[PDB]
From a paper:
However, none of the uncomplexed structures of CI-NTD corresponded to the identical sequence of the construct used for the interaction studies with Mor, which motivated a new crystallization effort. The new X-ray structure, which has by far the highest resolution for a [name]-1 CI-NTD structure obtained so far, resembles the overall previous structures of [name]-1 CI-NTD with the typical HTH motif. Generally, the structure is of high quality. It was determined at a maximum resolution of 1.29 Å with a final R factor of 14.97% and R free of 18.29%. However, several exposed side chains have alternate conformations (Met1, Ser6, Gln11, Ile12, Met13, Glu15, Ile23, Ser41, Ser44, Ile58, Glu69, Met73, Met79, and Val80) or are not fully visible in the electron density maps. However, there was definite disordered electron density beyond this point, which, after many attempts, was modeled as res 81 connected to the rest of the chain and two additional residues (83-84) after a one-residue gap. As modeled, the positions of res 81 and the res 83-84 segment are not compatible with each other, but each represents one of presumably multiple conformations assumed by the chain in this area. Gln55, Glu69, and Met73 (underlined in the sequences above) stand out as interface residues taking on different conformations in different crystal structures. In the most recent high-resolution structure, there are no such interactions and two conformations were necessary for adequate modeling of the side chain. An omit map where Glu69 was modeled as Ala clearly indicates that the Glu69 side chain density would clash with Phe67 of Mor in the complex; thus, a considerable rearrangement is required on complex formation. Instead, the most notable rearrangement upon complex formation is Glu69, which forms an unusual interaction with the aromatic ring of Phe67 in Mor through its aliphatic chain.
Author numbering: 1 to 81, 83 to 84
The structure:
């Protein structure tokens, strides 16, 4: 069994009372440190199950939110310990 990245993002937003604006703004310092861009439009496509994140944007969002990258991809693993 597994889930998808859209469900994982929705779990984050329910656990921590976040909206997409919070996710995107929390990511800004990480986008600069890692050299990985994420736009408002792209993040909405991930939450609405229109596209899956590529390798670089999983890494960005897993570091931003402090969660396992395998978990954020939708595998049935622990939320925190990969990377």
């Amino acid at each position: 069994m597994q889930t998808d990245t859209s469900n994982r993002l929705k779990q984050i937003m329910a656990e921590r009372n976040l909206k997409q604006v919070d996710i995107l703004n929390l990511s800004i310092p990480f986008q600069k440190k890692f050299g990985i861009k994420l736009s408002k439009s792209t993040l909405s496509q991930y939450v609405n199950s229109v596209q899956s994140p590529d390798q670089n944007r999983i890494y960005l969002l897993a570091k931003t939110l402090g969660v396992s990258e395998a978990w954020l991809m939708g595998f049935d693993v622990p939320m925190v310990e990969s990377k």
